[PDB]
């Protein structure tokens, strides 16, 4: 349902928001968008959000500051509310 496609180069991160049934993309970057960043971005799309977090596969939390680009390097979990999203970049 988390997708990672790169368009012009960039990556966008197409996502499920709870309050709505149409899905919202965001266009983040690599060199100077952070995790803190994105998930911002998320919770002003979206009032229905009260909690958003990334984790690695792992399961361990993501610090807010840490680079889009490094972020993007491997797959992560999404949280988002009640759900969790495995979502899979591809590899650069």
Same mark, same amino acid.
């Given at each position: @349902?988390?997708?990672?496609?790169?368009?012009? !180069?960039?990556?966008?991160?197409? &996502?499920?928001?709870?309050?709505?049934? *149409?899905?919202?993309?965001?266009?983040?970057?690599?060199?100077?968008?952070?995790?803190?960043?994105?998930?911002?971005?998320?919770? *002003? *799309? @979206?009032? !229905?959000? @009260?909690?958003?977090?990334?984790?690695?596969?792992? !399961?361990?939390?993501?610090?807010?500051?840490? !680079?889009? @680009?490094?972020?993007?390097? $491997? $797959?992560? #979990?999404? &949280?988002?509310?009640?759900?969790?999203?495995?979502?899979?970049?591809? #590899?650069?």
């Amino acid at each position: @349902d988390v997708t990672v496609v790169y368009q012009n !180069g960039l990556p966008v991160i197409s &996502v499920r928001l709870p309050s709505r049934r *149409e899905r919202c993309q965001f266009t983040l970057k690599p060199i100077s968008d952070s995790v803190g960043v994105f998930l911002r971005q998320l919770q *002003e *799309e @979206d009032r !229905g959000i @009260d909690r958003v977090a990334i984790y690695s596969p792992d !399961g361990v939390r993501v610090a807010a500051s840490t !680079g889009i @680009d490094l972020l993007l390097l $491997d $797959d992560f #979990k999404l &949280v988002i509310n009640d759900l969790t999203y495995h979502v899979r970049p591809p #590899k650069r």
